[PDB]
Design a protein around this motif. Structure first.
Motif, PDB file in Angstrom:
ATOM      1  N   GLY A 154       0.856  -1.173   0.000  1.00 20.08           N
ATOM      2  CA  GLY A 154       0.000   0.000   0.000  1.00 20.08           C
ATOM      3  C   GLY A 154       0.895   1.227   0.000  1.00 20.08           C
ATOM      4  N   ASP A 155       0.651   2.167   0.894  1.00 18.93           N
ATOM      5  CA  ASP A 155       1.471   3.374   0.922  1.00 18.93           C
ATOM      6  C   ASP A 155       2.823   3.196   1.654  1.00 18.93           C
ATOM      7  N   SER A 156       2.999   2.111   2.399  1.00 17.38           N
ATOM      8  CA  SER A 156       4.233   1.863   3.072  1.00 17.38           C
ATOM      9  C   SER A 156       5.226   1.459   2.008  1.00 17.38           C
ATOM     10  N   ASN A 187      -0.541   8.491   9.060  1.00 14.59           N
ATOM     11  CA  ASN A 187      -0.076   7.930  10.337  1.00 14.59           C
ATOM     12  C   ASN A 187       1.168   7.037  10.218  1.00 14.59           C
ATOM     13  N   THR A 188       2.177   7.560   9.518  1.00 14.84           N
ATOM     14  CA  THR A 188       3.405   6.840   9.235  1.00 14.84           C
ATOM     15  C   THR A 188       4.250   6.640  10.504  1.00 14.84           C
ATOM     16  N   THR A 296       1.800   2.481   7.627  1.00 17.35           N
ATOM     17  CA  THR A 296       0.831   3.497   7.275  1.00 17.35           C
ATOM     18  C   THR A 296      -0.594   2.942   7.402  1.00 17.35           C
ATOM     19  N   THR A 297      -1.562   3.840   7.371  1.00  8.68           N
ATOM     20  CA  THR A 297      -2.968   3.471   7.477  1.00  8.68           C
ATOM     21  C   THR A 297      -3.639   3.833   6.156  1.00  8.68           C
ATOM     22  N   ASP A 298      -4.304   2.854   5.515  1.00  8.18           N
ATOM     23  CA  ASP A 298      -4.956   3.044   4.211  1.00  8.18           C
ATOM     24  C   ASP A 298      -6.359   3.705   4.310  1.00  8.18           C
ATOM     25  N   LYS A 299      -6.928   4.045   3.166  1.00  8.28           N
ATOM     26  CA  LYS A 299      -8.180   4.785   3.129  1.00  8.28           C
ATOM     27  C   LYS A 299      -9.300   4.107   3.918  1.00  8.28           C
ATOM     28  N   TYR A 302      -7.063   0.160   7.604  1.00  8.46           N
ATOM     29  CA  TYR A 302      -6.163  -0.982   7.883  1.00  8.46           C
ATOM     30  C   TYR A 302      -4.718  -0.549   7.868  1.00  8.46           C
ATOM     31  N   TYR A 303      -3.921  -1.157   8.751  1.00  5.59           N
ATOM     32  CA  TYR A 303      -2.459  -0.998   8.751  1.00  5.59           C
ATOM     33  C   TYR A 303      -1.840  -1.772   7.599  1.00  5.59           C
TER      34      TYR A 303
END
Length: 315
Positions: A154-156, A187-188, A296-299, A302-303
């Protein structure tokens, strides 16, 4: 005493990209360069004579240190045919023959040297022509420098390497790219653990170690939208980056050999420089492993966890 390159007949010599983990004497994550050569030595050769080996301009014998003492040329039983010294200026090893060339005739030999791409000369993935030589006899091979990819969930997105080992002060330098895809990340949390870590950030104890705590040196830098990071993962000039270390003064916590950096919501890449301490084994060898993860936390709330792990294990 004299140079006997002309009295050295080269039978084979190959250059290839190898995997650093297979360099048993000094194993580490990442790719290396393998130079494998075979030759025979004329019987006229005597103790104190010399032959040379040439490294490519763009490699160095070790990219974590300057301990550039090359391995001996040995026969199959490990008996020493010659001892070498490295000249950094000429990028050439000068090997000096021992009494072995006086005790024996019709001598033949094999030598396998390992070196590493100079990440300053080759900052990004490219193809490049490498040129080595045994006894002045040159060979050239085209290879492609692959650098590692970020681990992305995801964004991580995160990646890291070791860049510099100081055996005297017993420290190791690690450089981490946080969010190098310059995603928008919510929330990285970035963890740095003195242990191996898998691709999802799970810490795996016992497989090497560093010390991660209050005193561990830890600099953080912010990257501009218009700056691209070297794919090599190694930064040589931090002046060009915005140093945001002091902003993490109150966003750092330590628990059980793990550091947690509260990055919060972000839209840029960052670089972390870590200089940490290690402890060598009883037999004097190295067993260094250090890892990092991005959460990170997705839209949908979830972590997502991305991990990366480096190591140095010698023999």
């Amino acid at each position: 005493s004299n140079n006997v390159n002309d009295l050295i007949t080269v039978t084979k010599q190959t250059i290839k990209v190898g995997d650093g983990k297979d360099n048993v004497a000094a194993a580490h994550d990442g790719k290396d360069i393998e130079y494998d050569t075979e030759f025979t030595i004329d019987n006229k050769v005597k103790k104190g004579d010399t032959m040379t080996i040439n490294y490519d301009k763009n490699v160095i014998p070790s990219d974590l240190t300057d301990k550039n003492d090359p391995i001996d040329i040995t026969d199959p039983s490990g008996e020493v045919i010659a001892k070498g010294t490295f000249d950094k200026a000429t990028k050439q090893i000068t090997y000096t023959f021992t009494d072995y060339v006086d005790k024996y005739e019709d001598i033949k030999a094999r030598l396998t040297l390992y070196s590493y791409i100079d990440k300053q000369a080759v900052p990004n993935e490219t193809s490049l022509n490498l040129t080595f030589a045994t006894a002045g006899k040159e060979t050239s091979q085209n290879v492609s420098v692959d650098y590692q990819d970020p681990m992305v969930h995801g964004d991580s997105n995160i990646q890291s390497i070791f860049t510099k080992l100081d055996e005297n002060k017993q420290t190791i330098e690690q450089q981490i790219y946080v969010n190098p895809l310059k995603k928008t990340a919510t929330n990285t949390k970035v963890d740095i653990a003195g242990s191996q870590v898998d691709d999802y950030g799970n810490i795996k104890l016992g497989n090497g170690s560093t010390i991660i705590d209050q005193n561990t040196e830890m600099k953080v830098y912010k990257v501009n939208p218009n700056q691209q990071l070297p794919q090599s993962n190694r930064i040589y000039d931090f002046s060009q980056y915005e140093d945001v270390t002091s902003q993490f003064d109150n966003k750092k916590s330590f628990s059980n050999n793990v550091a947690t950096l509260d990055f919060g919501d972000i839209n840029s890449a960052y670089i972390i420089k870590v200089v940490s301490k290690y402890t060598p084994t009883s037999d004097g060898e190295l067993d260094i492993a250090q890892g990092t993860s991005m959460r990170t936390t997705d839209k949908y709330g979830y972590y997502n966890y991305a991990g990366y792990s480096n190591f140095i294990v010698t023999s």
